[PDB]
Amino acid sequence: TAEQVAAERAARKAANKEKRAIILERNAAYQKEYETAERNIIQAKRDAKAAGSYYVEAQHKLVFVVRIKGINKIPPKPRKVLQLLRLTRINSGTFVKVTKATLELLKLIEPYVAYGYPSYSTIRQLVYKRGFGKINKQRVPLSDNAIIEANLGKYGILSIDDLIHEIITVGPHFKQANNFLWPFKLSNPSGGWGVPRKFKHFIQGGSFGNREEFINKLVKSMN
Amino acid sequence: GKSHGYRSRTRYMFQRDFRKHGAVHLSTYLKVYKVGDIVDIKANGSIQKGMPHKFYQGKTGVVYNVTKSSVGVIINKMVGNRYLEKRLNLRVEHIKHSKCRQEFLERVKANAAKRAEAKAQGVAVQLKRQPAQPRESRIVSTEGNVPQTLAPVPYETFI
Amino acid sequence: PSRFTKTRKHRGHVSAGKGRIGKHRKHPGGRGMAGGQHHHRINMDKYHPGYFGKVGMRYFHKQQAHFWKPVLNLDKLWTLIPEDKRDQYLKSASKETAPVIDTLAAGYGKILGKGRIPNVPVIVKARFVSKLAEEKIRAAGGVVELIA
Amino acid sequence: AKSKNHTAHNQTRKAHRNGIKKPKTYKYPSLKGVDPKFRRNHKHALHGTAKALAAAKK
Amino acid sequence: VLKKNPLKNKQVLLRLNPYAKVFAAEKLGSKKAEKTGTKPAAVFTETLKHD
Amino acid sequence: AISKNLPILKNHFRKHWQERVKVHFDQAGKKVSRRNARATRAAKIAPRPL
Amino acid sequence: GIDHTSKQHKRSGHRTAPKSDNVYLKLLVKLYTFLARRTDAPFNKVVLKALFLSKINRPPVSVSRIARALKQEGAANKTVVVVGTVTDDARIFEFPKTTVAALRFTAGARAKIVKAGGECITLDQLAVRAPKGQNTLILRGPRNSREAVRHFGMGPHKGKAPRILSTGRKFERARGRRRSKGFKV
RNA sequence: GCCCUGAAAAUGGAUGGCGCUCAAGCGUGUUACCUAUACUCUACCGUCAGGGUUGAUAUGAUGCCCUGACGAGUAGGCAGG
RNA sequence: AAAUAUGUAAGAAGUCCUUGUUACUUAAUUGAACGUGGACAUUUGAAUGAAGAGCUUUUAGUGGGCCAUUUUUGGUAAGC
RNA sequence: GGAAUACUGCCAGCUGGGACUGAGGACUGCGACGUAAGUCAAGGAUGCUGGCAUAAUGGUUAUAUGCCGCCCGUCUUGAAACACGGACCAAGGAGUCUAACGUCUAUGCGAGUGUUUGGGUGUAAAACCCAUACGCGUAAUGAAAGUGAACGUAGGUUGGGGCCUCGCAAGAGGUGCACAAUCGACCGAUCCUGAUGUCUUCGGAUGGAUUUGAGUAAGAGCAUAGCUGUUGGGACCCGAAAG
């Protein structure tokens, strides 16, 4: 009894040591993955140019969507879509994997949201600052990797950076990973919307619809 | 006053197709129907017996009975806030195997087979359909295709 | 008791439970069974199919209990022998000393045939038996004796 | 006084509170309206196969 | 009892994700790219600057 | 008026019934009387049996 | 605001405790909620809940009904559990041994069971013998056998029983009940 | 395009008012700034949910404790007071 | 001959092999139904979500409605 | 030709100023820095100094000042309404009780159940006790005369909680009450079949049917009480012209 604890204690201390080391290996490898994908794309473009060709980039596999209309007066069809995408509150936001079956959802909803292509930076900070997970309904702040592993370990994914990676690379458990992430609760943008009126399209002078890369600037000020 | 007979509102619905009036070709009488088959109902107004009421035009149900000259069909109809189960006795002139149950059965076979060659190779399968995906990077060349540049065009009347 | 009564809980809401528009008025729709063939017919067919109209023969001065004939199923029957004396007859099971059972004494008027009885013979005195009832008694090696 | 005559207004809101669900699907459904001869013979078919299943239990 | 934000507060930054330690130590949130000379081809500039 | 799915009652009170209600509060009293009478009959009945 | 998808502040529709104030029942409950919580054992969870049920949902289990269940293959030695009361039934003659744990035995049922060499146990007694419900057979009465339920779902063509107070030809047997009198049902 | 004519009604009077003419007017562009019971973070009240805990050990087991989410309301239903 | 709306399907209640029952059916153990026995569970057969799913009884109020965009009928029109 | 700068973006780059908060209450957790012992900003504030006593401060109240604020009750799609009631204040003032019921619940007993018409008894309208009956239930179906519930371990199929067996687990097999769906069997009605018999017109075996029933298929009820709901009653309170 007086002894035993040291068994189980130094056990887990050791177990922890190893878990931590794995995350260290992994996180260092994702740094590489990323660093060389990005570099790759850059050189691709310069080579095409050099060959008198044009590199044309892969279409985005991933979007972040933020609902920007409040909740009254909404037509039933977009209303359902807004809910199936977990957007039932103004300024709350989620990740959507882009395919045809989801792209037609974003179309139905376009007047009520602002969306785009999030950067690693933005995703990293969304998940660090406002990442909470769903665990028997309850909404739980991701404040230790143990919590992620305990629910997402079964798919690989045993750190918060494992999570970010399954989000940014989309990839095989994106469904399950992304769903575990509660809807992000953003503030109003600090510095404003930058347009006199939100409820027109970004193309028309602003807010609503796909603003593409410019989602990062907006989300960063909301986060 | 108002008028709501049985074939009310059906002038274009029960009409025959342009240049397709007359005898119905024998294929229609040679199809075989089984309990559990999925048929689409579509009235032929040249055959007045065994005729679906117009609510069922364009609807698809399941065969629940087979008879000398008709199949019985089960349709689920919405009345109020609830579907009621309806059974219809349609003659065969008014019915047609549902073509999508055919793609489906074909794929189930295709699926069994894909599974077979995969196991008798001991490899992963992947049998469910993915939706259309984003599109991967390409390099377009310019050999013979130096971009032609266009500009908007001045207004002009052609009247 | 009144203190558990929604009428106490309604004090201070205008109007008790009864609505602003519809009021609790003083008999709409008529009294009692008014308009059962008129404005109350939907409730009356559905809920009371059969209600209106005649069916059958009248019978003047009928005397219930000319018809008295309360039924007992084989199913029980052994219940008419009292609990203690019951084990012995069951075990003995003989044609020579088998138990009388005056079913009329017990208050019954006919022995119907639902149920099984154990093999043991029984002498059943009754007025009226069903065809099958008598058939099961006999298979167990008892008889029916008609009495009055 | 004349009053309003008809409308559907609100009716789908109302049907969708508790509403729509779907059919109530069973394996072994109602044989209601199925060919009487056929059924009468199905009976005998089923009796027999039951018989034999029990025959294969000695 | 209190959500601390790893994006301020290096302690919980280090708690979730080490690596950060090396990330910072090695810089690499900066970090010079290599250097290539590759030139665009004639045609690319002809048409950039076209009409 | 007829509503809901309920049995059809036939409560016969269309008639001034309140002028003929008999509540037997005398249940206990009449009993004490019945006995006191039985007592004194037997009394004067000498040793006869009632 | 929030576009709510589901009723807020909805309460599970389930009893959480018996509506009864019988001290003893509360004690059986207090026992079982310890058991339910502290052991795995599906059994106690089931028995826990059944303790909360109202009278209509504890129909009685009869002694012939136990006789029958005991004839299940491999069941003869199980101890049969009735979270409610067991009633006598003069209809079986041969009744077997076993041990029945119930909330209540009618006098005849105790007799019957006992006379055949068996035993009557209360639920706490069943608890000590079987903290995990080992070798038990939970039995339930026929609930839809009740008179009330004859009249549910009453309507045209439903096959149900009217709420009639008094029966014979002359009571609800004419128009709407036979083809010869208006329509039929 | 702006502006002018076309352009008539009854108490005195309304770009909301003052007043404004390279506007404080009309078209367009760019920044900053003000501000809701909304959004973000935190405390507290309640409601609902999930979870732990009388195992021997003072004072509430319909209790104590942990955790997440939620809160508009006539007619009207139920609950706790 | 659109657009918007609209029916069905996307599998374990499935698939395949073997061969049992019948009074139906066939020239015909031929079909039709329903089955025994045998094989196939990682993506088991698109997506997204699920704040749990299914079910029963009983009962209140209501049963004058009105407004906006869009479709639209009568009317010169109407805050019709 | 070689640079610079702008623009846009990234840094787990370093720093200054200001504002609100400081929930929790021994210790348990994840870490960080140390060669180390130790230290720490790591599962929610501490430390140092000062100020106040017929006082600092807080509650209340009156008044001023900024901004805001139409009369309630009612019917109504719409009332502050140039709709109605209401000058003021006390006291009074409207869903009751009864007969019979539906659902739900609690309770007693349970194939039964209901002592209270009555009797016994009494510390006297109480409490205590009880014989025969009767009511409802345990049989249904027919207009009726009538007839009246096991082919089968009270049947077959599919789901079923729980339990049993193998297994370290995942799992697999066994058994499967309640409940649901479906095929069958049994009782009555209807329509067929019409045997052995008999007095010749009685009898009605046996086997059937897209027919039919508020049935059977190892009983649930009877009674007391409560909320809600139903019908008759002055029937939530107040009101005709009339007869």
mmCIF file of C-alpha atoms (C1' of nucleotides) in Angstrom, chain D residues 26-31 36 39-40 43-44 46 50, chain J residues 151 156-158 180-185 208-210:
data_model
loop_
_atom_site.group_PDB
_atom_site.id
_atom_site.type_symbol
_atom_site.label_atom_id
_atom_site.label_comp_id
_atom_site.label_asym_id
_atom_site.label_seq_id
_atom_site.Cartn_x
_atom_site.Cartn_y
_atom_site.Cartn_z
ATOM 1 C CA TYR D 26 -42.505 -3.637 -40.441
ATOM 2 C CA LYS D 27 -41.080 -6.861 -41.655
ATOM 3 C CA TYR D 28 -44.166 -9.060 -42.031
ATOM 4 C CA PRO D 29 -46.710 -6.530 -43.152
ATOM 5 C CA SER D 30 -50.504 -6.521 -43.436
ATOM 6 C CA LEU D 31 -51.705 -9.077 -45.943
ATOM 7 C CA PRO D 36 -57.510 -14.833 -51.593
ATOM 8 C CA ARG D 39 -53.319 -16.817 -49.491
ATOM 9 C CA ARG D 40 -55.410 -19.876 -49.033
ATOM 10 C CA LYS D 43 -51.438 -21.291 -45.549
ATOM 11 C CA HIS D 44 -50.950 -24.901 -46.548
ATOM 12 C CA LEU D 46 -46.500 -22.720 -44.361
ATOM 13 C CA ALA D 50 -43.534 -25.968 -40.224
ATOM 14 C "C1'" C J 151 -53.358 -30.284 -32.983
ATOM 15 C "C1'" G J 156 -44.514 -20.948 -35.869
ATOM 16 C "C1'" U J 157 -41.406 -16.549 -37.651
ATOM 17 C "C1'" U J 158 -38.616 -11.592 -36.552
ATOM 18 C "C1'" A J 180 -44.336 -4.679 -31.279
ATOM 19 C "C1'" A J 181 -45.193 -6.988 -36.235
ATOM 20 C "C1'" U J 182 -46.764 -11.255 -38.903
ATOM 21 C "C1'" C J 183 -48.581 -16.576 -40.209
ATOM 22 C "C1'" G J 184 -51.648 -20.254 -37.616
ATOM 23 C "C1'" A J 185 -55.057 -22.921 -33.868
ATOM 24 C "C1'" G J 208 -64.286 -25.776 -45.125
ATOM 25 C "C1'" A J 209 -64.763 -20.103 -46.437
ATOM 26 C "C1'" U J 210 -61.279 -12.426 -49.734
#
